[PDB]
Design a protein around this ligand. Structure first.
Ligand SMILES: [Zn+2]
Ligand SMILES: [Zn+2]
Length: 266
């Protein structure tokens, strides 16, 4: 069995990214089933399960194992939400969709990258090239659109900048009468291949994209923040409490400012 959808990528970086963690309940019906360096969430909606992201291709079996350790059947995963079409977050999604029958859910631009399993021309990391497992079974959400399943309501928020189709997901998780607003934030890291310039006129959609993302992340109700790379939000697997999403955005803003200045230095 040479499985195209799980054949490993980035095996050296994966030693850190995929370091194991026990799966844990976040709050309510919502759980973490990812790794030390890459977040994967699992929502039990009462009418099926929803996963958020899929890590690397070889992570798909590890994710399904974690889902089982929590007592769930992966055959009940109905949707896999995608924050971005890069192989460290989408790499395992095709395998997960194959094995579960789930529909993959993304932004319009995100879906285009998922279908291709390759970088789009306006992706800051286009020049890195490469290919990763492509996805075909795709549902596009518009910015502000809500996915309702079981008793859960998940809102899609376009949060471009890292790529044009990067997308953040929010929903409420409840325990008895107490509910918390959870945000699973796409990366906002301004990184690129070597020759890419964020200050080029052709990059303006990406830079205006970051500005819209900062405004969105400042507006969200955000009792709990799960960052696609959890170290971007700090120590531990998620951050909580007033201000988390705003701090996350400010971190990105500071990195972007530093990057723009770097490009404007002689
Ligand atoms: Zn990325
Ligand atoms: Zn990433």
């Amino acid at each position: 069995s040479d499985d195209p959808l799980t054949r490993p990528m980035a095996v050296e970086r994966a030693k850190e990214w995929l370091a194991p963690l026990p799966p844990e309940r976040v709050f309510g019906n919502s759980y973490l089933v990812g790794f030390a360096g890459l977040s994967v969430a699992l929502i039990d909606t009462g009418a099926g399960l929803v996963l958020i992201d899929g890590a690397l291709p070889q992570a798909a079996p590890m994710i399904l194992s974690n889902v089982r350790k929590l007592g769930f059947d992966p055959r009940d995963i109905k949707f896999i939400l995608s924050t971005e079409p890069h192989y460290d977050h989408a790499g395992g999604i095709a395998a997960l969709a194959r094995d579960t029958g789930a529909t993959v859910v993304a932004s319009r631009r995100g879906a285009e990258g998922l279908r291709a399993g390759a970088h789009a021309k306006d992706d800051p990391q286009f020049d890195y090239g490469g290919a990763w497992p492509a996805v075909s079974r795709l549902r596009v959400m518009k910015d502000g659109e809500v996915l309702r399943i079981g008793r859960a309501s998940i809102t899609a928020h376009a949060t471009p900048g890292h790529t044009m189709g990067s997308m953040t997901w929010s929903w409420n998780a409840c325990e008895g009468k107490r509910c918390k607003a959870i945000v699973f934030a796409s990366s906002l890291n301004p990184v690129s291949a070597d020759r890419y310039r964020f200050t080029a006129p052709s990059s303006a959609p990406i830079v205006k994209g970051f500005e819209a993302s900062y405004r969105r992340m400042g507006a969200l109700k955000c009792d709990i923040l799960i960052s696609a790379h959890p170290d971007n939000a700090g120590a531990g697997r998620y951050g909580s409490g007033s201000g988390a999403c705003r701090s996350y955005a400010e971190r990105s803003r500071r990195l972007l400012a530093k990057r723009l200045a770097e490009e404007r230095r002689e």
